[PDB]
Design a protein around this ligand. Structure first.
Ligand SMILES: Nc1ncnc2c1ncn2[C@@H]1O[C@H](COP(=O)(O)OP(=O)(O)OP(=O)(O)O)[C@@H](O)[C@H]1O
Ligand SMILES: Cc1cn([C@H]2C[C@H](O)[C@@H](COP(=O)(O)OP(=O)(O)OP(=O)(O)O)O2)c(=O)[nH]c1=O
Ligand SMILES: Cc1cn([C@H]2C[C@H](O)[C@@H](COP(=O)(O)OP(=O)(O)OP(=O)(O)O)O2)c(=O)[nH]c1=O
Ligand SMILES: [Mg+2]
Ligand SMILES: [Mg+2]
Ligand SMILES: [Mn+2]
Ligand SMILES: [Mn+2]
Ligand SMILES: [Mn+2]
Ligand SMILES: [Mn+2]
Lengths: 287, 683, 287, 683
């Protein structure tokens, strides 16, 4: 009942980072403190890693196991967006704002950062555990994918949105909003596929799947807290970002057909502001 | 968020199911009381203010010195006697952000609306205190609105040219192309839009000095012009605007159109240059019969006949060109070209369409020259003569380049005051003064044509606003009846004023004797046809005003024959883009685009309801995109029969309309006598 | 040396089925004979069936085994074009020209057809034989992929190009030309990835891989000749189609860095008409 | 494949481990016998050939009308009596593909080498049969090669100008910029390269008529000029080439340099415009001391002092500009700018480097003006005065532009014939005739400066060829000794010929009395120093030739003081690229880039060994990329001390060299008195 409308929405949202000129951010970037620039680079690098694996591994593997040519076409399109559009856009931003050495250093930093490695290990592990014709392993990977789309990106998205909302780094911010617009529909779509599998189960099996989903969310959440503190303490925003990731965790659960898990909190209002041809016939010449 | 912006944003907050239109009066009141009265430079009296403005290089002292200070004080008191109040926030905002004189640091307001109007009236009167008071009453009543250049710059030392529309003929030579680039940069530097005719340039692949395949065509000249207009960006606040016109029978027509394709290569794309196409009746005839057509290489025609292709009658010369072996031509599909034009207009809104035969079958000055192209706004239609710019140390053969200073009658206010005749005559006098005070030092043909032709453009605005505020549908027959009667009266009184000026000054425009005004052929339809309203509702709107009859037109024809006509051109309906807000009037004679105009200024968004918009007249304020473009064409053709120049005619198309719908609209416009089509706007 | 350049060319060639209006083809379709309509339907179904294998298996399997983030992104983009753009385009052409029952029957026939099946299963067999971390098996699959993209499609493309060059079925011919333009670049790109593997091999292993490629080409070519006679004898075109197959076989070989196998032939003109900073050290200023 | 091309390709086929150099003579003989003789039109006699060429609009009949046909026949016999044979295939191929006159269809050959030489000699002699015979002997002996424009176009009706290098001063105004664009287009239409000085244009962000931040800077004018040169690309036969020069102290220097960055945006990037930088000694001094430097806004300086920044002495006025609050300036890092120049030259070979103080410390016409910029080849160094182009109908203040007609001495042939004096004097006469017969009617400053200054450029070629064929290393002290002696003799005889021409015509060049020639300061080093060879081997090379001594230089100084000088500038070593093949010589005074040149003509690859290359002189034909650029700088500085204009100096860099090595080479060249550096070529 939904794939065709998602197909149409995905293809109509198609974009390339080159459509957005980035030289306009040069001055507002120059004006940020060293702490702010450091957090910003690292945040986008963490996002780049997530999209790299979502494009290389997550979306293609889910596409392989989901039945139906139209469902596969949507998932293939989403995969392309992840690595050919999203992951690449971050390099466009980096190449504009930062010198090569700072770019090299931040990519080295992703490799050695323990929270980023842990979250990649956990998510990619679940993708690679999918067994052919085994719907339960597929469900588990789809939960992981929804958590990546609708929860994990948001510790990263906070900062570009926070600046966009203050009228700073608005070209980079425009790119990020386009990425976010895509991930929102990706999270909903994968969520609907996960619910299909969940709804086939006995009540006993469903109870276990909810346990899996909640245990996984909590494990990812605890790691994301440490990641958030590590990045944001130097810019004074860790508590604010934490509220934002909890907000988005609830959206991820909802995408999976589950009740919200965290209590509602006031999000920084700055971040909220950050959000034919037909031929002419002979009679056409007479009136 | 300022208080006035908060009040204005309350417009869209529906209360009781209806928009709170009364919030705009509150919004404008708060805007004034909290920003304008605070940020207005204070002067003890008019004498001190005028002395400060003149001393600080704000006001030119040449025009002010013609009046004794008592006269200036009386004129200023006349301006303030009306107690004029801006009815909506947007009008006052536009005035005090675009036209109100501000200190060099742009932090304080030196001019109120009354001060600006009084200065403009004093500039117009040229020493006549009673004339100045009449101008003050005309503008304060908002019956007549001088164009943005004249209104903003009049009486200002830093002022640019009061004329803003320029048309240049380009001759087929490197000297002429260089001179055209120089003149375009010079005129853009003055802030005026420049339109060039490229139909005389030889097509790509033509020989230069018996060297074949050497010419780069009109697209290389277009790249040069685009770079020149980009360089002369007028401080960059308003990017340099230029238009290039090419005849449809030019060889480079396909390449000329390809410059506006999004898929076009960047080395061919022309970003800052608008393009118009001149379509003779021959092309429409060829497309209608599906016959194969030919595009000609202009230089071969010029060599064969000693005259330019665009200087000849294509309806008489097309067969001779086709049958002449010495003329080089390549085959095209006229219907394919029309479809390409429709597709390009849908994608980018370009090119402008000029129907040459529609323009020239009613042109009064065909003896001087036929109208070969239009301006950047597509409403200027005048005879032009190309110049011959020779080598250095060689005398140049200066031709005639087109220019006109613009003014707009406020139809609603002119009808409310029942002052069509007086308003038209005062506007004609002001336009004549602006024309006589213009002297372009780097456009010899522009200056010569301004001196010889004395062309003026008197437009109109608030047609849709007036009709909606009177219970008349824009597309209805009654709307066309009113437009017919009103613009017939406007033409009658502008012709009468032109003849009276010719009688008083003892001179007509150059080559007036060969014009249709002199021979009387112009007045045939006016002496044979009655243009009084055919509907009682429309006839009542003109009650209290004398509608000229066939006898009145006969008398005017005899008077013109006796005394001649001072202006070669009098009437043209320009878009009137930003000055309509100040007048609280709808733009030009086009139907409104939106009922409520939502715009973002700074970081706060503002809402502008159409003037007079209310629940009772909400349905009469039908948006253009919802309108039948055939009825809009009918209305524009009704108006155009009384306008000697063109009318800026924007096509408002829904996204669901195919290229065939656009082609049919263009074909119906050509069938109905439409001279030019300005833009294809899609919702 | 080449992936970013191909990335650029691929993304700038992006298109969607909806851009070409198909209905005006019915004005020439109605004037074709039964044999012409039959051949066209069968050719179209052949292309559709082969392209589906490439979208579901060929491109995604190569993307899976190739190392390099940028290569995976380009390959993902190509897989997207197969599944989201090409497959929808073929379906659109069919739905325009034939009623539902006729489409189902043609696909039933072509699905059972011996020559179509032989080539489809030969290609799919090589994709299924790729082994993790074995570059030889990957190379063999890449050869199969290049043969599909740059060679096997062309016995089919011939007919739409033949009509397109005559002014018949112009809307569907425009679509086919866009598809063909994508397959050409796909073939060239995968060819470069195969040459990279080939160049890492010993001289004996190279000779062995050359023998593999030529042997595979021979098997496919002999089946193409039979496929060609089966479809084109009824419309009298087989001789010219055979020249077009050999010409495209030579292009496929050149994509793999190999010499042409067949002598140069002219092609049917109707089908042709269709087709080191270092700083100054304060002593450099003294001599 | 042609038989001659197969014979030529046998050059590279090693036989006995040695190149088959004798195969080139066979290649040229086969080329002639099989193509040139076949495709050479046949004429019964010279009278018939001359009639056919004149009537068919191939030759200008005016210059041939000054001789009786007997004299023309004698001149042609003199040219043909030599029985000149091309020594290599490439020489004849280049001549008969570029300079040999061909029928209008480019199918047959109407001119041989002798015919072209005779026509050029008759054009030079201007009606003198003995002088024409002398010119024929000079050219057929290949002692002198007229520049490509003169050689190709002399005596031809459908010809471009014989002068091909022009330098334009641009004043800071819209009129001046538009006139500069027009003049550049007019001059490129003539085939000449145009160099423009942009140092008087105000920098980006300067005020236009007391409105701040209105100026686009030199980059907008650069885009205008680039489009103008692209449009006027010589009918497509040769893309329009122009050069822009900016003083290093101009504020737009970084934006000006960034136009040549590969990563530069297409909006700012300039594609077809060469860029050179004028570096005063002040900038080098600042970079040497690592002191923070300032780049100035030219218009602020002009307003403060009334003069242009490039019209003032930077070495003296830099501190005053820095200390003047009314002069706007931007802090820069001079060493960072130097390194940016080095990196830009490594990546693209730009910009050209002009060392202003090196040029002007020896400039003989500083009273007329300082040298502010160079030409498109970086070897023209003359005083220029900017023109003031005013509004239409106003009088223009025409200044002095720069243009010189070039000719090259063939050093090997001149030394073999022991005819330095005769060759130099005849070349001076021919260049004077070319300058006198030149008249550009669309570049008033160029025409006025040509009439007033009478500037010529007498270059030299085959320095490396002559040295290698004589067993002398290009980098050896003996090579520098020979260059010193030879160019001292060339300068002596060119000065003597200029004085003789001034005496014969009784007229010097405009403002000669203020020149260093008039005051005698020019001859100080020549009267105080000796330039005879210091090596016996070099001294033997000049046997049979009189080497001017200090007494000779004193006599020449007295003669010049008595009679004056006809030419403001006489000597400039241009790159001389295309005609080097015809002359069978190494290009200019630069070392050879490659011993054997591999070229592709169509689908056939041609092999060109360096003229005179053989097994016994292989080591002396050392490639430029393998030489020490310091030794090349030493050679060029030895030559430059006898050239009044500049020497087109290309740097040949290996890919391993860093930007520091390029900077060191530049600094050594500045230290050694180098005036301009042309290109940074990397291998
Ligand atoms: N809508 C408006 N358009 C133009 N000027 C206005 C407007 N509203 C206020 N002003 C200016 O602000 C002044 C103060 O406005 P306000 O309505 O408070 O005046 P007032 O004391 O009631 O009397 P009056 O209307 O006669 O000025 C007005 O005199 C006028 O100068
Ligand atoms: C000089 C030049 C002209 N043109 C075009 C522009 C002009 O419209 C056209 C004519 O150039 P002209 O300047 O008129 O050349 P011409 O008059 O000397 O030669 P002819 O009499 O044969 O025309 O050629 C180019 O495209 N490129 C060029 O370089
Ligand atoms: C008109 C114009 C000038 N310029 C630059 C180019 C000129 O070198 C410089 C001066 O222009 P000018 O033509 O000299 O303008 P002006 O003389 O009226 O103003 P001023 O008294 O200050 O000299 O401004 C632009 O960059 N863009 C423009 O549109
Ligand atoms: Mg001409
Ligand atoms: Mg100026
Ligand atoms: Mn993503
Ligand atoms: Mn996603
Ligand atoms: Mn495909
Ligand atoms: Mn493919």
């Amino acid at each position: 009942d939904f794939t065709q409308m998602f197909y149409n929405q995905n293809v109509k949202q198609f974009w390339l980072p080159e459509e957005i000129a980035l030289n306009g951010d040069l001055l507002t970037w120059k004006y940020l403190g060293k702490n702010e620039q450091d957090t910003y680079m690292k945040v986008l690098a963490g996002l780049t890693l997530l999209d790299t694996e979502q494009g290389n591994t997550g979306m293609p593997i889910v596409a392989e196991h989901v039945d139906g040519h139209q469902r596969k076409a949507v998932l293939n399109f989403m995969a392309m967006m992840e690595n050919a559009v999203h992951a690449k856009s971050y390099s466009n931003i980096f190449m504009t704002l930062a010198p090569t050495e700072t770019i090299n250093e931040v990519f080295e930093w992703v490799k050695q950062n323990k929270y980023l490695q842990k979250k990649a290990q956990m998510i990619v592990g679940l993708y690679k555990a999918i067994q052919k014709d085994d719907e339960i392993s597929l469900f588990k990977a789809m939960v992981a994918s929804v958590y990546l789309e609708s929860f994990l990106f948001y510790s990263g998205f906070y900062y570009p949105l926070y600046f966009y909302g203050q009228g700073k780094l608005m070209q980079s911010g425009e790119i990020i909003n386009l990425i976010l617009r895509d991930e929102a529909i990706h999270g909903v779509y994968v969520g609907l596929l996960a619910q299909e599998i969940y709804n086939k189960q006995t009540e006993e099996k469903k109870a276990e799947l909810r346990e899996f989903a909640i245990d996984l969310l909590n494990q990812l959440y605890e790691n994301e807290l440490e990641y958030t503190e590590d990045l944001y303490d130097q810019v004074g925003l860790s508590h604010d970002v934490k509220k934002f990731i909890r907000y988005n965790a609830n959206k991820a659960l909802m995408n999976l057909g589950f009740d919200p898990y965290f209590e509602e909190e006031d999000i920084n209002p700055i971040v909220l502001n950050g959000l034919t041809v037909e031929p002419l016939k002979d009679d056409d010449f007479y009136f | 968020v300022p208080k006035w912006i908060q009040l204005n944003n309350e417009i869209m907050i529906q209360k009781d199911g209806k928009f709170q239109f009364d919030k705009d009066k509150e919004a404008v009141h708060s805007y004034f009381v909290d920003y304008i009265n605070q940020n207005t430079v204070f002067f003890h009296n008019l004498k001190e203010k005028l002395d400060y403005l003149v001393e600080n290089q704000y006001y030119e002292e040449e025009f002010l010195s013609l009046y004794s200070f008592e006269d200036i004080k009386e004129v200023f008191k006349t301006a303030y006697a009306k107690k004029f109040r801006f009815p909506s926030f947007m009008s006052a905002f536009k005035f005090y952000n675009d036209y109100a004189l501000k200190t060099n640091d742009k932090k304080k307001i030196l001019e109120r609306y009354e001060d600006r109007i009084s200065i403009v009236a004093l500039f117009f009167a040229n020493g006549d205190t009673e004339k100045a008071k009449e101008y003050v009453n005309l503008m304060i009543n908002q019956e007549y609105q001088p164009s943005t250049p004249t209104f903003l710059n009049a009486g200002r030392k830093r002022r640019g040219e009061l004329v803003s529309c320029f048309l240049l003929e380009v001759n087929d030579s490197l000297n002429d192309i260089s001179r055209a680039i120089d003149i375009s940069m010079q005129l853009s530097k003055l802030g005026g839009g420049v339109s060039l005719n490229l139909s005389k340039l030889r097509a790509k692949g033509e020989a230069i000095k018996d060297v074949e395949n050497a010419t780069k065509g009109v697209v290389g000249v277009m790249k040069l012009l685009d770079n020149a207009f980009r360089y002369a960006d007028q401080m960059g606040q308003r990017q340099g605007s230029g238009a290039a016109y090419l005849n449809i029978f030019h060889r480079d027509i396909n390449d000329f159109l390809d410059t506006k394709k999004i898929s076009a290569d960047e080395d061919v794309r022309v970003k800052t240059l608008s393009i118009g196409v001149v379509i003779p009746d021959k092309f429409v005839e060829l497309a209608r019969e599906d016959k194969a057509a030919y595009v000609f290489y202009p230089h071969t025609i010029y060599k064969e006949y000693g005259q330019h292709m665009d200087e000849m009658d294509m309806n008489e010369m097309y067969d001779k060109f086709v049958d002449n072996p010495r003329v080089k031509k390549e085959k095209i599909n006229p219907r394919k070209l029309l479809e390409k034009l429709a597709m390009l207009r849908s994608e980018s809104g370009y090119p402008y369409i000029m129907f040459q035969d529609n323009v020239n079958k009613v042109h009064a000055n065909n003896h001087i020259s036929k109208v070969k192209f239009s301006n950047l706004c597509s409403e200027v239609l005048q005879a032009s003569q190309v110049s011959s710019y020779t080598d250095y140390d060689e005398e140049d053969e200066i031709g005639l380049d087109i220019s006109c200073n613009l003014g707009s009658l406020n139809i609603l206010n002119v009808m409310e005051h029942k002052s069509i005749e007086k308003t038209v005559k005062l506007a004609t006098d002001s336009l004549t003064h602006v024309s006589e005070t213009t002297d372009i030092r780097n456009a010899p043909a522009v200056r010569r044509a301004n001196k010889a032709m004395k062309s003026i453009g008197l437009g109109a605005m608030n047609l849709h606003g007036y009709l909606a505020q009177n219970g008349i549908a824009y597309e209805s027959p009654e709307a066309r009846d009113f437009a017919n009667t009103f613009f017939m009266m406007v033409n009658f009184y502008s012709i009468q004023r032109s003849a009276e000026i010719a009688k008083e000054k003892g001179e007509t425009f150059d080559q007036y004797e060969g014009s249709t005004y002199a021979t009387g052929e112009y007045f045939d339809k006016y002496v044979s046809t009655d243009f009084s309203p055919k509907y009682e509702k429309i006839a009542n709107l003109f009650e209290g005003m004398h509608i000229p009859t066939t006898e009145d037109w006969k008398k005017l024809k005899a008077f013109v024959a006796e005394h001649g006509m001072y202006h070669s051109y009098r009437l043209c309906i320009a878009p009137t883009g930003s000055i309509s807000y100040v007048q609280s009037s709808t733009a030009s004679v086009m139907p409104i685009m939106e009922r409520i105009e939502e715009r973002t200024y700074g970081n706060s968004k503002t809402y502008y309801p159409m003037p007079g918009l209310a629940s009772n007249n909400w349905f009469f304020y039908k948006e253009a995109y919802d309108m039948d473009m055939f009825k809009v064409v009918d209305m524009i053709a009704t108006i155009q029969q009384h306008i000697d120049q063109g009318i800026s005619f924007t096509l408002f198309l829904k996204d669901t309309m195919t290229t065939r719908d656009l082609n049919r609209i263009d074909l119906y416009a050509h069938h109905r006598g439409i001279k030019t089509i300005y833009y294809a706007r899609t919702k």
